[PDB]
């Protein structure tokens, strides 16, 4: 499926991100969008 | 680039790894070896 890279993201954000992926599998896709936006927002 | 996948690692483990990975970039290769060990250990 679609892939999302987190280069400019903050490590704490990554932990929170991975936590959200686990909280609800269906949300992972939506979380991927926001998470991906952070890479741009924190870029 | 060599790409690694850790689906077997729990969020706490990935968080621990990501913190250690970030805190010690010089040891990123060695630390990854452990996560790869985890990949097998959590297999």
């Amino acid at each position: 499926g679609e892939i999302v890279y987190l280069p400019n993201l903050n490590p704490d954000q990554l932990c929170a991100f991975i936590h959200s992926l686990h909280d609800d599998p269906s949300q992972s896709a939506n979380l991927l969008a926001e998470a991906k936006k952070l890479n741009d927002a924190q870029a | 680039g060599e790409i690694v996948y850790l689906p077997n690692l729990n969020p706490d483990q990935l968080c621990a790894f990501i913190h250690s990975l970030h805190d010690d970039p010089s040891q990123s290769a060695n630390l990854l070896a452990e996560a790869k060990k985890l990949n097998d250990a959590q297999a």
């Binding site: 992926l21 991927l32 | 690692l9």
Partner: peptide, 25 residues
């Protein structure tokens, strides 16, 4: 360099946490 990324795999797994190691793929 190392990079953390999530792959959309659907299923009950949602996405998979994978990281890149060195340079660019």
């Amino acid at each position: 360099k190392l990079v953390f990324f999530a792959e959309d795999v659907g299923s009950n797994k949602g996405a998979i946490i994978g990281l890149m190691v060195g340079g660019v793929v």
